[PDB]
Ligand binder design. Structure first.
Ligand code: SGU
Ligand code: CA
Ligand code: NA
Length: 293
């Protein structure tokens, strides 16, 4: 595990997407932008994304899909009314910077705080909703699936505590969602693309005072979850076994993504230190649809 700092002075980095050339496109939630970090050290702003760009994934159209949580109040906190503009799913042209809003509601219900997302092999899009905190109450968590072609959005999970990281198993027959305040990883069986069958179960619950953020899946099927408070990556086997915890040096470790040769480099956002780092990983990551395969 040779650790290297790839970029600093990032304004709450999140949603890293590691390109084939080893460049990283990621979100800066606090600076409300999508940023490109190159291996020669240089950085460029790809697009301004007003609100709270929170997670990213490259889509089948070659555009970068964004979970926009609508904005926080700044370490993030509950958004004062004016700092919140509504949650949405958006799309950014990585060549022009054009931002288009795709969904801001499901049925008659506005999206609250979209957080992270993952494409299935047909181009369908899974995403989590962390909800928003208000003065005296908070939204429940949820997970949604947008049908291939961006034709329809559906609610698949609803009524958990806030949900954050999301991924698919290698065979894409299981969707994983990380429940933030409990440090529990939930697994949901899929009867087919975009459809949970009964709705799921927690396969791992960490002890102590540990919370979960975003995640990335390994080719082995292990789920690698950014772990807040204790500041590490928690590697969880498909059967729920805690395989290992890799310290990162930041209590606000928020996301991980695999790239580099054989997808054996982990790219991690340390959102407390404002850093993007890279770390050797003993096992290869799961190739993401429309990015790595
Ligand atoms: C504190 C929450 C909001 C952004 C995050 O990284 O998903 O975690
Ligand atoms: Ca997240
Ligand atoms: Na990730």
């Amino acid at each position: 595990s040779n650790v290297r700092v790839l970029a600093t002075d990032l304004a709450f980095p999140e949603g890293p997407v590691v390109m084939p050339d080893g460049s990283v496109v990621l979100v800066e939630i606090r600076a409300q932008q999508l940023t490109r970090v190159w291996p020669d050290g240089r950085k460029e702003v790809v697009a301004k994304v007003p609100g709270g760009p929170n997670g990213a994934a490259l889509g089948p159209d070659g555009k970068m899909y964004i979970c926009n949580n609508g904005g926080f109040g700044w370490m993030p906190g509950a958004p004062a009314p004016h700092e919140y503009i509504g949650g949405s799913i958006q799309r950014v042209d990585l060549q022009s910077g054009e931002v288009e809003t795709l969904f801001d509601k499901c049925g008659e219900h506005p999206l609250k705080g979209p957080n992270d997302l993952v494409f299935d092999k047909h181009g369908g899009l899974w995403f989590t909703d962390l909800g928003k905190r208000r003065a005296r109450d908070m939204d429940v968590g949820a997970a949604y699936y947008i049908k291939p072609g961006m034709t329809e959005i559906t609610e698949q999970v609803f009524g958990t505590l806030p949900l954050n990281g999301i991924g698919l198993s290698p065979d894409e027959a299981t969707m994983y969602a990380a429940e933030t305040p409990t440090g529990r990883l939930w697994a949901f069986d899929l009867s087919g693309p975009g459809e949970v069958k009964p709705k799921g179960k927690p396969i791992c619950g960490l002890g102590g005072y540990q919370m979960f953020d975003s995640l990335a899946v390994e080719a082995s099927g292990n789920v690698c979850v950014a772990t807040l408070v204790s500041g590490c990556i928690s590697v969880i086997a498909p059967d729920g076994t805690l395989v290992e915890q890799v310290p990162t040096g930041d209590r606000v470790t928020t996301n991980i993504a695999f790239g580099g040769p054989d997808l054996k480099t982990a790219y991690i956002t340390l959102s407390g230190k404002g850093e993007l780092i890279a770390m050797d990983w003993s096992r290869p990551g799961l190739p993401l649809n429309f990015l790595n395969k």
